[PDB]
Amino acid sequence: SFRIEYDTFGELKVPNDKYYGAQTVRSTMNFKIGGVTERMPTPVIKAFGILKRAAAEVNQDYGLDPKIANAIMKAADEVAEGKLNDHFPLVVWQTGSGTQTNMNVNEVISNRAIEMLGGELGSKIPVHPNDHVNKSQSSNDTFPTAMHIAAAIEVHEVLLPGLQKLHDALDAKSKEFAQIIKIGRTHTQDAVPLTLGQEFSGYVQQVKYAMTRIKAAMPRIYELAAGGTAVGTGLNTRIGFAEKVAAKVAALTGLPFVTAPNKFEALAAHDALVELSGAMNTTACSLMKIANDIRFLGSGPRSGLGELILPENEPGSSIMPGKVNPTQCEAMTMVAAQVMGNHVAVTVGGSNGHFELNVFKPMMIKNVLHSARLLGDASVSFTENCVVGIQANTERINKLMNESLMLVTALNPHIGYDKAAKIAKTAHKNGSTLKETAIELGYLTAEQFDEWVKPKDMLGPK
Amino acid sequence: SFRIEYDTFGELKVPNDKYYGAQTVRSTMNFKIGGVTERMPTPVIKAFGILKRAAAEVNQDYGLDPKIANAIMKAADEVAEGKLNDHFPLVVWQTGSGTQTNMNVNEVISNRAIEMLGGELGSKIPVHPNDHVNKSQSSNDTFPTAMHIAAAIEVHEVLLPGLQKLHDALDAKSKEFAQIIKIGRTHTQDAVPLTLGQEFSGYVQQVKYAMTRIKAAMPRIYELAAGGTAVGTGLNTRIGFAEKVAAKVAALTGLPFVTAPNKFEALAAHDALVELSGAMNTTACSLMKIANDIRFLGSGPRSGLGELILPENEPGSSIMPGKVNPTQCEAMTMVAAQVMGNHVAVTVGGSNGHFELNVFKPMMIKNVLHSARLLGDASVSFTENCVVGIQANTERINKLMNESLMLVTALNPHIGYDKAAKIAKTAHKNGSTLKETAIELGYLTAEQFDEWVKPKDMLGPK
Amino acid sequence: SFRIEYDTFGELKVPNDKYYGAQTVRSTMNFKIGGVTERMPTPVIKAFGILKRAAAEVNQDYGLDPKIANAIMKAADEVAEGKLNDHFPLVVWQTGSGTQTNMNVNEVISNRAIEMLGGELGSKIPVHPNDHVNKSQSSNDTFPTAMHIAAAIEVHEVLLPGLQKLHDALDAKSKEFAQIIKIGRTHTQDAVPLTLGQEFSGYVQQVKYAMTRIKAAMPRIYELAAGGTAVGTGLNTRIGFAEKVAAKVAALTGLPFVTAPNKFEALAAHDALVELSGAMNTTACSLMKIANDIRFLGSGPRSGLGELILPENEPGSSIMPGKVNPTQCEAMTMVAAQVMGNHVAVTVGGSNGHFELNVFKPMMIKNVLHSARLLGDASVSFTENCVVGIQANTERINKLMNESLMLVTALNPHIGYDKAAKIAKTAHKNGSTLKETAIELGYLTAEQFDEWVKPKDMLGPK
Amino acid sequence: SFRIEYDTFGELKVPNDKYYGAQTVRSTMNFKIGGVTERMPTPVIKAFGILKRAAAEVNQDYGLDPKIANAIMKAADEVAEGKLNDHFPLVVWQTGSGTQTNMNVNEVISNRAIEMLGGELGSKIPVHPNDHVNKSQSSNDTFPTAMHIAAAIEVHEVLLPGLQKLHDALDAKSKEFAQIIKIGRTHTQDAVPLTLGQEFSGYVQQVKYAMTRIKAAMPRIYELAAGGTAVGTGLNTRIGFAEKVAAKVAALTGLPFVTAPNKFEALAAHDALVELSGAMNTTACSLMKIANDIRFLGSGPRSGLGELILPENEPGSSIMPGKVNPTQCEAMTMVAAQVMGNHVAVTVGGSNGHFELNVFKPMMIKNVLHSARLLGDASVSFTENCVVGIQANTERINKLMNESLMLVTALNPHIGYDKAAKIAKTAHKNGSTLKETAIELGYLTAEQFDEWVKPKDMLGPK
C-alpha cells in the first residue's frame, strides 16, 4: 500500500494513493506544528498550479520538450482547479521561504504528469520535479509569486464581490429609509434629527471607501518575484523568463500581473502584503462600526433602542415574542477583531526580513488570505441574512420623536429662547412631551405647535 | 552665557545655567527625533537618582572616598526628588541601551556635587562623572536598572492607588444599588432581571482582578540588572556589588528589589516589561467594558437606555435639559485604547533583542510608564468626576420593568405555559403591558398578577 | 440517505450518518464563513463532552432519571475522547455566545445516547437535547465553561510540556557549552567574552520564566461560569449546581476547577483569556529572541557568525557543503509573530463586552487555543529537530577569540593603558592580532602574552 | 494675578497673562490625565488657527461684521503661526469629540482679537467666542476638520520630506557601491553573490514605495467635516459654508482640501486616519528591515559581518578602536516599533464609533501625528548621521569573497559537477579556499581558476 522513495537521509514510504514524494514526506516528518487546520491555504496551492502551468509553457522557449511541457501544463491545471487538494499535507509552519510547499507542488505535478504519460510514479521519469517542473525557477522566488497570485485572486473573487453585495444592500436600505426621521445620537446622548436613510448612507460610504482602499492596495500585489532566483539577481534563470512568466500568468488569470521592477525588494520584503492587510484592517474598522451600530439599533424589544427589526434566522420560543439576537452582527464583529489581530501578525512578519530574503512568507500570506476570506464571506452572510431583511420600527421611532426634547429649538423663531427653554425644562421635570407642556404653559396652541415644529425642515443647512 | 567643555571630537558650548556636560550636549546634537515632548520620562530620571545614590553609598566598600560619596549622595537625592528635571534634555529616541541618559545623569550629579563642594563646574574635580558617579557600573546595566525602579514605583504610587479608588467607589455604588432591579441585556436584547448592584458587582470584581494581575506581574520587575556590566558576566565590577546595590535600592524605596538571578536574561531581554504591559493590557480590556457600559447606561434622556444619571461637570445649555455627555467615559475608553497600542509597541521591542543586549530599552519603558500613568490618573478622574456621583433613574427603571415582556415566565406555574405565551404575544402585538393584557384576556385578576409576578424572587437559583 | 427533522422555520434534511440534528443544520445554513479550516477547535468540543458528562451525573441530585443520566454520560464520554469529531460542523464565526455549538453538543449527545438505548435518532426520545442534556444549564453559561476547561487542559497537556522539553534541552546544552568562551556582542558590536554556556543560560531562564508566567495566568482560568445561567443570577438553575458541576469537572480532569465567585464578571467578560493570552505573548517575545539568536549564531558557514552547527534535517546538495538553513528557527519565529497577532484579536474581543454578556466568545478561545497549540508544538519541534543536536564550532570560535581586539584590556595591569591602546590601534590598522602586534612593538614577549591574557579570568566580577 | 470669569457652574480664576477663559479653566480641572506631557499636539492647535481664520473670512458672506472678522483673522493667524502655544493647557484625554479644545481655541482667539481692538479681556466684547469665532460651526465638526488639516500638513512638511532625503541618500550609496560584489545571505546562510549597490537598490525601492503608499492614503484625509454640524445634516449652518470653508483652507495651505461628500461618514468614523496610519505602519516595516540590515552589516569589527563602516558620532575609547555602535539604527528601529503600536491604538479608536459621532478623536490624531513626526525626524537623522557617511569595508569584502564556498559553481562548465563538489567538500573540511584546494587536488591551475571564476559574470540571468 506504499511505494519506497529515497532522499539523502534514506528511504521513505509514500502512500500509493498520493502524488507527492520523498521530499514532501520528509517535510511532514519534521514540521508537526498545529495539525491539519494549519495546512497551507488552498488558494496558495491553486496559485502554484497557475504558476507552474505558466512556467512550463514559457520554458518551451528555453529547451523544454513540448511533450513534457504539455503533460506538466495539464497536471498543473488539475492543481489550479482544486482537483488534487488531498495531495498537499504541509502546514504553514514550515521553512520560512515556502520552499517545502514549492517542492510539494513540483512532486505532485511531476507524478500526475508521469501518470498521464503512463509511467511509474516516484520514478521522476519522464517528468522530473526539479529539472522540468521547477525549470528556470528557484527555491526562493516561487512561493512569493504564488502568494501574490493567490492574494490577487482572493481579492477579486471573494473580498471585493462580498463588499460589493453589502454596499448595494446598505444602499437599497438607505433609499428605502430615506423618509424615516429619527433622533440622532452623539456621545450616545439624544441629538438633533436625521433620517435612517442619512445614517445608512454613512455606512454605504464606508463600504464604498473600503473597496477603494483595497483596490489602492493592489498595484504592488500584481508585481511578481518570479525571475529573481536565489537573491534577486536572476542568476541561473534565463533572460526574458521573468517577463514572459508574468505575462503568461496575466493572460491565464485576466489580471494585470507584471514582473517586479526590483527583485531585491520583492524577495527581501513583503511590504505589499503588509499594505493589503492594512487596507483590510481599515475595512474591519468600518465594518465593526456598521455592525455594532445595527446591533444596538435593533436592541430591545422594549429596554433598548428599538429602531430596527432584524430578521430572525434561529428559531425562538413562543413565550419570547419580539426577541431577536443579532447573530450576524456578532459573526461580523468577531471577524473584524480577527482581521485586526491578523494584521499585527502580518506586520511583525513583514518587519523581520534579513538581508536578501524575508523568511516569514507562509505566515504572512496565511493571515492575508484568512482576513480576505473572512471579510468577504462575512459580508455576504451579513448582507443576505441581516441587511436585506432589516425593517424600521416606524411606530416606535415616531413615538420617540414626539417624546424627544430635541425638537424644541424649532420654537425659538416663534416664541423666543426663554419660553422654549422653559418648555424643555418643564417637560423634562414632569415627564411630559414638548407639545403637552407648551400648551399647558399657555405659550401656544396645539395647531401652532403642529405648524411650527416640522422635523422634515430640520434635516439640512438653510 | 556658556562654558567650554570638550570631548575627543572637539569643543562644545555648555550653558552656564545647566549641570550637564559635553557628553550630554553631544548627545542632543545627534538625536533630535520628535522634539521636547519626547524627552525621557521623569520617572526614569528620578529612578536614576535613586540608583546613583545607592551606588555611591555601596562604593565606599570598594574604595570611594566618603567625602566624595556623600556629595554624590546629596546631588543624587536632588535628582531623585525632581529638583533637577530641567537638566535632562535627551529624548527617548536615543541609543537603545540608554547609555546617553546614564551619562546625562552622571554629568549632572558630578557637577551638582562639585558645586556642593565649592569647586568648578565642568572640571570633573573633585567628582568625576565616570570614575566616581559611574564607579563599578557600566554603560549597559544602569538604564535597565533605572527602568525597573521607575516601573515599580509608578505601579505602587500611581497605578494601583488609582485602581483601588475606582474599586472602592464601584463597590459603594454596588451596595447603594443593591435593591434596584432592572432588565438584563444579553446580545443587547432584553433579558431576565438583575439588580444594578449585581451588575456593578461584576465591575468591582474586574477591578479587583486587575489589581491582582498587576501585582502578579511585579515579581520580575523587582529583579535588577545592576552588576551584569557589559554582557552579563560582571567583568569589571566587584564581587558583592550587584547584591549590595539592590539591597540599598530596596531600603531606600521600601520595595522588595533584588538582584536578577541571571544577568544574561536581564540584559538581553526585557520580558518583565512585556509581562507588566500585558497586565495593563488586560486591565485596559476591563476598563473599556466598565466605561462603555456606564456610557450606554447613561444614554438618553429619552432615546437611549436611561438607567443612570451621570454627574454633569461641564456647563450645559438651558434649552437642553437632561442632556449629559459621559465625558469621563470618553477619556477612560481613549486611554484603554492607547494602552492596547502601547502594549504592541512594548511587545515588538521586547521581541527584538540581539545576543547579549536588548537595545529597545528607552521605547519599552516609555510605553510602560505612559500606560501606568494614564490608567492610574484616568481611574482617579473617572472615580471622582463620574462614579461617585452616579445616580439611578429609579422612576424610569421601574416603568421599564413594568413594561417589559421578560417577566412573563413568572406566570407559568400559575396559568401554564400556553396562556403565558399568549399574553406575551398579544402584549407585543398591541403595545400594552403584560398585566393589562393578562386582564383583558380574562386569564387572571390584577390582584393575582401582583401576587404572582414578583421580580425580587427572580434573582437567583432555587 | 437523510432523515427529516423540523424546527420552527420548517423541515430540514439531516444525514443518516450524522448524530447532530435540526438546530445544527439550521446553524450551518446561516453561518457559511471561512470554510472547514474554521471549524470549532477540537479542544472545545472535547471540553463540552467533559462538561455534559459532569452535568448529567450532578443532575441526578435534581430529578434526572439515572438510566437517562448514565446514557448521557457514556455518550458525553465519547465526545470527550474525540470519538465523534465528525459530527461537529459549525465554525468559529457563529453566534457570539457559543450557543450554537452548545446545541450541537446537546443534539449529538442526545442522539448517540438514544442509539445506545436502541431508539430512533432524531426523535428526542428517550433523551431530549434540551430537557435532559442541557438540564440545569443555559444558552449563555455553557460555552464559557467549555472554553476554560479547554484552555486549562491545553496549557497542562500541550503548552507547558512543550516548554518544559525546550527548557531541559537548552539547559543541557548550557552545561555542555559551559567551558566554550566566545566574544560577546552588544549593539551587534564585538564585546567582552562570555561562554556559550552563559549565553544559553539566559535562554534557559527565559523559558523557565515563561512557564512561571503561564502558571501565574491560570488561577482565573480555573473559575467556571456554569451556574450563572442567562445573566449571571442563576435564575432557572438549582442551588448547588454551580459548585457540584465545578467539583465534578475538577474530579474528572484532575485540575483545580472551581465555580467563579462572581458570575456577572464571568459572563460579561473573558479577562482571564486576555490574561492567559498575555502570558503567551510574553512567551512569544522570549522565543523570538532565542530562535533568532540561534539563527544568527548558526549563520555561515563563512560569511556569517559561525558559532553553532545546527542539525541538517532537509537534504542539501553535495556541492554546497556546510550550508544548513535554520528552518526550525523559521517555524518558531513565524509562530511567535502569529501569537502576537492572536493576542491583539483576543484583546479586541475582550474589550468589547456589552452589559451582561460578552459575545466574542468563540473568536477569543479560538485564538487562545491556537497560540497554545502552536507554542507547545513548535517548542517540541525546535527542541527535537534543532536544540538537542546543536554543536559548537569550537575551531572557528577559538580562532576568532585569538583575533579579537576585545581581550586587550587584560594587558593594562602589566604594561599600562597607553601601550595597551597602542597595541589595539596598531592591530586594527594592520589587520594583525593583539599578540603579533604586542611582540612586534616590543612591549612584551610571547610567553608574557600567554601568561597575562587568559580569557578564563575575564568571565566574572573580582 | 487673575481675572474673574464665570460659567453656569460659578466663578473661575483666569490668569491675567493667559488668553483662554472660563470654559478652558473648567476643562483643566476635570481632565488632568497624564500631566503636561499629554497636552494636545501643537499641529492640532495650529490647524485650528487655519480653520478659524478660514471660517471668519467666509462668514462675512453670512452676516459677520468685517471689522470683527478681520480681528479674528489676525488672532487666528497668530495661533496658526505658533505664537500662542502657551495658551493651550488641555490634554489629549478630554472629551472624545475634541469640543473642549475647540472652545479653548475660540476663547484664545476671542481674547487676542479683543486685545487687538483695544477692548477688555474676558468681556466677550466686541468678539464673542461662540457667536463670532465659532459662527456657523459646531462643537462636533470643528475638531475633526482641524485633525485632517494637521495630518495633511505633517505629511507634506515633515514625513514625506524626511523619507525623500532618505530615499536620495540610499540611492547615492547604491550607485557608489554598484561595483562592490559581496556574498548574499538567504536564511542568514551564505548565498550567491550580489553587489552592495543591488542590495541597497532594494532599500531604495522600499522607501520609494513607502512614499507612494503614504500619498495613496491621503485622498480621504483631504476631506473635511466642517459643515456637518451636530450629527452630519448641517442643521444650524448655512448653505455653501461647508464648501466655502474647505476652499478657503485649501487656498491658505496650498493643499487640495475638499468638503467631505458624506458628512455622516466624516463624523461617525475616522477611517481615513486608520488608512494613513496603515501606510505609516507599512513604512515602519520597510524601515525596520533597512535599519536592521545596516545594523548587522556594520557588525564587528572582527566577530560580525563587517561589510560596512558606519560613521561614529559619539566619542569612543582609544583602547577600543574599530568599535562603532549603530546608534541611529537603534533610534530608527525603536521608532518603527512605536509606529506599529500607535497603529493598533488608532485602529481600536477607529473601530469604536457610536451612531452619529466617533468620540475617540483626540487619541486617534495624537497617534497619527506622533507616528508621522517620528518617522520624518528619524529619516532625516538616520540619513544625515548614518547613511550619507557609510563606507564599504572593501578589503574585508574581497577577502570573504575569495574565502567563500559559494563561487564553486563557476567551475562546473569547465571541470564538471563532480570535481566541483569534491573541491567544495575538501575546502570545507580543511578550512582552505576553493582555489587552494582546486590546485592541491590537481583539477586545474591557478591561471585557469582566475579565468573561470569571475564573480562579475554571476550577477544576472543569461
Verbal overview:
The structure is a homotetramer of 462-residue chains. By secondary structure, chain A is mainly alpha-helical. Chain A folds into three domains: 3-138, Orthogonal Bundle (Fumarase C, Chain B, domain 1); 139-406, Fumarase C, Chain A, domain 2 (Up-down Bundle); 407-458, Fumarase/aspartase (C-terminal domain) (Ribonucleotide Reductase Protein R1, domain 1, Orthogonal Bundle), CATH 1.10.40. Chain A has helices spanning 22-30, 42-58, 66-80, 99-116, 129-133, 143-176, 196-216, 241-253, 263-268, 271-297, 327-351, 361-385, 394-403, 412-415, 417-430, 434-440, 446-452; strands at residues 2-7, 10-15, 181-186, 189-195, 223-224, 258-259, 308-309, 391-392. In chain A, the strands form four sheets. The first copy, chain A, has a two-stranded antiparallel sheet with strand order 1-2. In chain A, helix 15 (417-430) crosses helix 16 (434-440). Chain A is elongated, with a radius of gyration of 30 Å. At the B-C interface, strand 3, strand 4, helix 7, helix 9 and helix 10 of B face strand 3, strand 4, helix 7, helix 9 and helix 10 of C. Chains A, B, C, D: InterPro entries: Fum_hydII, Fumarase/histidase_N, Fumarase_C_C, Fumarate_lyase_CS, Fumarate_lyase_fam, Fumarate_lyase_N, L-Aspartase-like. Chains A, B, C, D: The record marks 330 as: Important for catalytic activity. Chains A, B, C, D: The modification Phosphoserine is found at residue 318. Chains A, B, C, D: The modification N6-acetyllysine is found at residues 13, 18, 32, 46, 67, 74, 165, 175, 208, 244, 454.
